[PDB]
């Protein structure tokens, strides 16, 4: 009836051609088509969110440069940034620039991101980042100066789940071992390239992203470092799975929402080209798994709960961590502000690799075939289920702010592995995704 | 026919840098009043960018540094110790100077800053004395001490050099070990700039005058012998001490020097310009020696 | 007004079952197991097993000093980022338990941990004339080594195969590592006035055009002649009439050995600049090469195959 002529001031009609092309029984069809069209123009970024409306037949470009300061949150209590966005260049494209001094943990960043929509569909955001950082890691005393640049390809379909096919290539210089460090760190300082190819799936079906009540969050990650075509100097295969949850029971509709969590992961050292057998160098300290702190397993320091070399917490290949939430409401208040109570009993184990099965190799032991590392992983997972897990418990006063879930907990550890530095009460967590 | 390029005569010595001062003493001892010119200048006014610099008009050669100058114009234990002390003065004895007179604001800015200003053109003191202070502060590293009961460290870092230079018999007809005719001028220059200045905050003068009688006598004798009444009788340029910088006295030249010096200090495109300018000047210097670069 | 911490005294006793330690990973049980003290130097991977000399004269000095001190230790390569200070040649005592290691021992206290009979000949106040030459080694020959290895396009292959090949194994990182190395070298050599003290804007002259490749080489040749002339007053094949070589002989050997080994090639011979190895072999009548070959008789007696 009425083809698209209005609002096409800045953007292209070729882009707006395919967003609602098939406008072709009379009572409510158009009433549903307009609802589909507005929800399609919503996941874009060009159109202005205020006047995103079109009258029944028979807005404008948002901006071009949008600076900001803000303060994001990345599990570190302090942050900062200064964006510089360009909401259109050719079609529905974009660019970006963050300079996140980020205060406490990291000390720099420069992310000259560049997104774009691909082939009409507004979800194939083929970003091309070019990053930089100098982050301080005080649990294993050193810094790390990443200088990478990746080519991501994401896709958010019509059911809430997402995807990713990033291709990163970093530099990973560990150049901060000034204080008393452990010789495991010294034996790892240097360089790397870590050209990888990951894939992140996440079916986020929860209601309150900072305070789940009735949903369930499956979220998998599957890294694959230098191997075969994609070369480099590190070679491994890393996976990680998470499955949160929450479900109310009964009393009004007062929030009870007993919930739980889970985390699995593996780190399988691989050979360095077009095979599955051959020499397989063990993993470095840049790739292993940390598990602890107020976010993933509460009751322990931000890097504890793992193989410890004294005062520095080196990682570990395989791990597993669970949780149980309570989320009881405030006394005689009701479904008011997000300040709610909480009870938890956090568990989780993390053990590293070892061979202990073949000594005939003698010289140059830093090389194993597939059988050796396979039996090593078998022994690791066998050691994972021999003994009581860490199992630390405590209470806290959640605060489901729209962006950050402040916790302010008080917990005590029950089962410890000698030399693991479990926290004892009065920790202040903050972040995006707890356990 | 040669023509030197040195600092200014500020302190009553023909220079304020032991290198060019020693070059002046050497030339005055070996050549004769009718051979050189002692053109006063500044580091940014010579292709070498290293101030003590010869210019032999017979073949148009630029020769930076003092050791390269004495390379031109030219038992065995004598010369062996000569080279040994020539190398031991150029390091651990120049950083003993720069521990004072160039790094400590309590001592730099009361006698050194006006001395530098009184030898430079009008707009240049904005930029070059900062460069020289940065240089002498870099050279004063590897010493652990900076601008400052934390005083014995000064005495130690001075003895660790004066005791090596002590048992040398720096100027006489007989004694411990006669060194050479050349390096004696270098030792004179360094010990003079270590003793003679007015130094409103002195800490080397007392140590030298109360511990090493040979050094004070050597410096005073060498000054009174070859440098009478401030060395004004030296064959300076045609006009005079201040009138020496006449070959680069045009306002255009000083403006170019100032604009180069300030352009080489911008945040990001400064390093590239500085590297390019240094490369071009070194190419010119090599082309002056009858060589062939790319 | 600072009062002590809470005194309720019931926070303890809560950790219920403290279990056994966590069995450190693979890459921390072969590289750090240890049976003897483990010196970290810039050595190769093959040379690290037999204890051959390194190719960094700042670490060859300490390795030679420790071998002369009748100490038994191991040698492992490293990358200069893992050190208590910025410089590499540090030592690590062996482990007392698989979850604890004593503090490292940096380059300034190696010959204090080495004490078995008389460790006095290796660190003592030199004669006042001795320092006049110990400054001839550390400031002229060092700048010669730098300006010859890093900032000389004829020695590009040697630098690229020693210092940046065992580092990353990636081209785009090898390039930046080579650039950082050459920048630091040009900055460190352009400070000693023997090479060049050119005055530019307030930033050290980190470029291959700040120094000149004439003065450094000439001062190196003069330093070698002076060192040979000092050695010819010895009468005991060691510098100061001493039976066993002390710190001075090791300090000279650190540069002499490497200059005879790596930068001692025969090419066109028309360039004029003779390789530092030839100058070592010709200083005087050969008085330095004989001293070097005598130093490999108190340090590496079981080794053979040097001179190249």
Residue numbers in the entry:
A (entry chain B): 47 to 70, 78 to 111, 132 to 324, 329 to 512
B (entry chain C): 2 to 75, 105 to 178, 237 to 382
C (entry chain A): 14 to 128, 139 to 289, 292 to 333
What's in the article?
The SAM complex facilitates outer membrane β-barrel precursor protein folding and insertion into the outer membrane. The SAM complex consists of one copy each of Sam50, which spans the mitochondrial outer membrane, and Sam35 and Sam37, which sit on the cytosolic side of the membrane. Sam50 forms a 16-stranded β-barrel which is minimally closed between strands β1 and β16. The structures of Sam35 and Sam37 reveal that they each adopt a GST-like fold, which is also completely different from the BAM lipoproteins.
